[PDB]
Structure 1
Amino acid sequence: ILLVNLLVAMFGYTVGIVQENNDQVWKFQRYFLVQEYCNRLNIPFPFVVFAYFYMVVKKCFKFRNEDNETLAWEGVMKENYLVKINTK
């Protein structure tokens, strides 16, 4: 009775605390599954072993200007952001 009903109360307190952080932690974890399913040029899982043999095929034989342009884009909203802060 006492020790089980104390566990209920401590669970209730922890659920109450972690909930506003919980959605953030879930969508932070979302990055890793997107990076494990968007990285590999990936076919069906059962068939994947056949595509693994394509990698065997590999071992059967084996400053940029738009970058500076998008950094120059970033600088303008930086200036507008600084204007907003100094306006506050």
Structure 2
Amino acid sequence: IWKFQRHDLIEEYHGRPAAPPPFILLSHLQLFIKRVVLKRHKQLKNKLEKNEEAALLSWEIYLKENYLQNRQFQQKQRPEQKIED
């Protein structure tokens, strides 16, 4: 439960500007004037290159079939399976 609880704190501090709060007004002014005139950070959510994503998904779909054989093979070693055979 603690390890699951760990994440959102790191999230909230990752999003926060760097100043201690007597100087956080220096951060608030620039962001407020940038949102006055007219997006996550790219370390937690990024839209990859299409050409890159094709290679990544092909690597993934390779690895799945390597998982499945070990899954069904160790499923063949339960004793109820042996009695049925």
TM range (shorter): 0.5 to 0.7
Structure 2 residues without counterparts, runs of 5 or longer? 39-48, 75-85
- For 2:43, the equivalent position in structure 1 comes to none
Q: Which residues of structure 1 form unaligned runs of 5+?
A: 1-24
The normalised TM-score by structure 1 is 0.60
Structure 1 residue 84 corresponds to structure 2 residue 70: yes
RMSD: 1.8
Structure 1 runs of 4+ off > 4 angstroms? Answer: none
In structure 2, what is the Cα distance between the partners aligned to 1:64 and 1:48?
Answer: 38
Give percent identity, aligned residues only: 35
Structure index of larger Rg: 1
Q: 2:24 — aligned with what?
A: 48
Bigger share in helix: 1
The Cα shift of 1:79 comes to 0.9
For normalisation by structure 2, the TM-score amounts to 0.62
